[PDB]
Amino acid sequence: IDQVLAGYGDNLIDRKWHGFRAKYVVLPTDIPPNTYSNPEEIRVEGLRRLIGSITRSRLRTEKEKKGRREEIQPEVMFYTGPLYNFINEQQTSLESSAINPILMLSNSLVIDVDPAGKSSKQESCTVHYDRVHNPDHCFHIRLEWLTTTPKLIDDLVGNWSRLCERYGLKMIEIPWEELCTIPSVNPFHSFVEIKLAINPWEDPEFKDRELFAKSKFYYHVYLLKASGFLLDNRASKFLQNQDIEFDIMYSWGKPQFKYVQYIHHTGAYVAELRENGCLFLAPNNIYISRVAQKVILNFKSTCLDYQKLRSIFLDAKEMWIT
Amino acid sequence: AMVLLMGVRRCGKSSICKVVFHNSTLIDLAVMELPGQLNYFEPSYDSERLFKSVGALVYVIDSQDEYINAITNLAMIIEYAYKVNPSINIEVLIHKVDGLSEDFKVDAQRDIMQRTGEELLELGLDGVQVSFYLTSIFDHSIYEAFSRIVQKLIPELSFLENMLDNLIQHSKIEKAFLFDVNSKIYVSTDSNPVDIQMYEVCSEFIDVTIDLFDLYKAPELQNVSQLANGVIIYLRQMIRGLALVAIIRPNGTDMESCLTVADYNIDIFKKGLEDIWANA
Numbered sequence: 001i002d003q004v005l006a007g008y009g010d011n012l013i014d015r016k017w018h019g020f021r022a023k024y025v026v027l028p029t030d031i032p033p034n035t036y037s038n039p040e041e042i043r044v045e046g047l048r049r050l051i052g053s054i055t056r057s058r059l060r061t062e063k064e065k066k067g068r069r070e071e072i073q074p075e076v077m078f079y080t081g082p083l084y085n086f087i088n089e090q091q092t093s094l095e096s097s098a099i100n101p102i103l104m105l106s107n108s109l110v111i112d113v114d115p116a117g118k119s120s121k122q123e124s125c126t127v128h129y130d131r132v133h134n135p136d137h138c139f140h141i142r143l144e145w146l147t148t149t150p151k152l153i154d155d156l157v158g159n160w161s162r163l164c165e166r167y168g169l170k171m172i173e174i175p176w177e178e179l180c181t182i183p184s185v186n187p188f189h190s191f192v193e194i195k196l197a198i199n200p201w202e203d204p205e206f207k208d209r210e211l212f213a214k215s216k217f218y219y220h221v222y223l224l225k226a227s228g229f230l231l232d233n234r235a236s237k238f239l240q241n242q243d244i245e246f247d248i249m250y251s252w253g254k255p256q257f258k259y260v261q262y263i264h265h266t267g268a269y270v271a272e273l274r275e276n277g278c279l280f281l282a283p284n285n286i287y288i289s290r291v292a293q294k295v296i297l298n299f300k301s302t303c304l305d306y307q308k309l310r311s312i313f314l315d316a317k318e319m320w321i322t
Numbered sequence: 323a324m325v326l327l328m329g330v331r332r333c334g335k336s337s338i339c340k341v342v343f344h345n346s347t348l349i350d351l352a353v354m355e356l357p358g359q360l361n362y363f364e365p366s367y368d369s370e371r372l373f374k375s376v377g378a379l380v381y382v383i384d385s386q387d388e389y390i391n392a393i394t395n396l397a398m399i400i401e402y403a404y405k406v407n408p409s410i411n412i413e414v415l416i417h418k419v420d421g422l423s424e425d426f427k428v429d430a431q432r433d434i435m436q437r438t439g440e441e442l443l444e445l446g447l448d449g450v451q452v453s454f455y456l457t458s459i460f461d462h463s464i465y466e467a468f469s470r471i472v473q474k475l476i477p478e479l480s481f482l483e484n485m486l487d488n489l490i491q492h493s494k495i496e497k498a499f500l501f502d503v504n505s506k507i508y509v510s511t512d513s514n515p516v517d518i519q520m521y522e523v524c525s526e527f528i529d530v531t532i533d534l535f536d537l538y539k540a541p542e543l544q545n546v547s548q549l550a551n552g553v554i555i556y557l558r559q560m561i562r563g564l565a566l567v568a569i570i571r572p573n574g575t576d577m578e579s580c581l582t583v584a585d586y587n588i589d590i591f592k593k594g595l596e597d598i599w600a601n602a
């Protein structure tokens with residue numbers, strides 16, 4: 001701790017201890033009135049402006065502080081479908097500025113959280129931002145800090161949230177650890193496991209080997225889509241079915257996620273899809289405390305009622321047929 | 323110095339006008355209300371002369387309703403208002419704040435200030451300073467806000483401050499206000515802080531004076547109201563609609579001698595005020 005606090009953090013050794021961490025998720029929610037300056041490309045400009053504001057907040061030395069064009073912001077690259085389809089797509093023998101044997105899906109930089117000289121110390125967090133984005137896949141920004149004031153980072157997050165809300169989107173905060181570990185950390189947290197009413201892997205009304213070869217969790221993914229959820233773990237191995245050019249590693253570490261995670265588009269609830277078809281459902285206490293209980297109970301009812309789940313699965317089968 | 327009142331519909335502009343101005347440069351002129359709804363602004367629709375003829379633009383934001391779109395519209399208005407004329411003072415009133423706590427009021431003002439600053443940073447406007455005042459009809463706040471707005475449009479402010487400070491230092495005056503006969507918008511004072519209680523005392527003294535005079539008419543307004551503790555309140559009409567109300571303390575002296583020296587000093591001050599064309 002004293003070594004990394006003195007500027008000797010370049011040891012490049014995986015320490016067993018972690019600093020203070022915060023994970024923020026950008027979720028497309030709603031376009032504000034006016035601000036015309038299409039509802040599917042203004043969010044592209046919103047993420048571009050957010051990344052530009054983050055990179056413009058880079059911590060700089062006094063020699064670069066006294067001096068006066070900075071480099072352009074890194075590009076965020078968009079695609080449709082699972083991420084492994086895009087990874088098995090870069091093979092194209094054209095260009096070199098396309099996600100470029102571990103693949104760094106994010107990049108990091110040190111920021112200058114207090115610019116105005118409000119604090120007597122030197123404030124310095126570390127931001128991690130992804131290099132990919134989909135309208136159906138939520139966006140990740142990560143703040144890692146060790147000794148910063150936990151109020152300047154709050155108003156920095158507020159400035160980011162306002163900059164988002166000028167455009168569409170909605171910045172939310174989710175716990176860094178997995179949803180499945182909240183009973184193993186916080187025993188008071190609400191956490192319900194869902195064994196849904198109709199098993200699509202063995203029901204006679206919904207069963208096909210070709211569909212399960214194509215998409216094993218097709219009914220569950222469509223159930224989560226129709227109930228208003230966005231995929232959090234975009235880089236997991238439970239939904240896509242393709243190969244890879246060795247493992248992918250984030251700019252902060254290896255993804256140690258047991259199951260795929262989903263965030264409600266409101267930002268209030270977190271779901272998690274297990275291997276055996278069960279689900280985990282919990283509320284986001286940080287959003288509720290910073291800023292509403294009938295929605296999660298209604299989702300539990302839809303996952304427990306046979307008729308409503310049958311209707312959603314029938315809609316999934318009807319869309320699969322047509 | 324004509325000020326333009328702007329805001330969304332049902333924000334309270336007409337009610338503010340009725341309360342203040344109904345109960346040139348300095349007199350309470352017939353101000354212009356402007357109902358601005360959300361729309362796309364037409365580029366230069368013969369509005370350059372109108373905004374060039376406004377001394378200071380005033381914006382009204384309802385704190386009860388949502389106001390992010392209101393701040394966006396305000397930034398859109400400032401975007402051409404500052405471009406047309408770089409000498410306009412810009413004022414924003416956070417109206418309808420009677421039923422809010424002090425912490426909520428301070429947080430709301432801080433949020434409004436930060437949002438306006440961020441929107442002006444996005445629009446690229448620099449060198450602009452927008453003032454903010456927490457106003458409400460039911461209290462003294464709107465009178466003080468209009469007092470500051472009017473004071474920003476009198477170029478002889480510091481000289482009036484020196485004249486009132488010299489008058490106060492030589493007459494044992496606790497606090498002297500240069501009110502206007504209508505709207506109770508005090509124009510100048512001393513370097514002493516404007517106490518709210520003393521301001522309300524002087525304003526209701528203005529009201530008592532005008533009502534009692536209006537009760538007996540059809541046959542230069544002067545008033546001496548002495549309290550039990552010797553503290554006197556004095557009124558003398560200045561040039562045009564201006565009037566002077568001074569809370570003067572006796573400090574254990576003769577009442578009539580203090581009244582005589584105050585009358586002589588205030589007559590001298592009015593003779594000095596005759597030279598400067600601060601009236602109307």
Ligand SMILES: Nc1nc2c(ncn2[C@@H]2O[C@H](COP(=O)(O)OP(=O)(O)O)[C@@H](O)[C@H]2O)c(=O)[nH]1
Pocket residue numbers: 330331332333334335336337338357417418419420457458459460
């Ligand atoms: N409680 C409270 N209500 C206010 C205040 N100012 C305005 N209002 C309300 O606003 C309404 C009048 O709005 P109005 O002046 O006609 O809006 P305008 O015509 O667009 O300027 C009244 O019904 C009041 O209830 C205030 O300071 N306090």
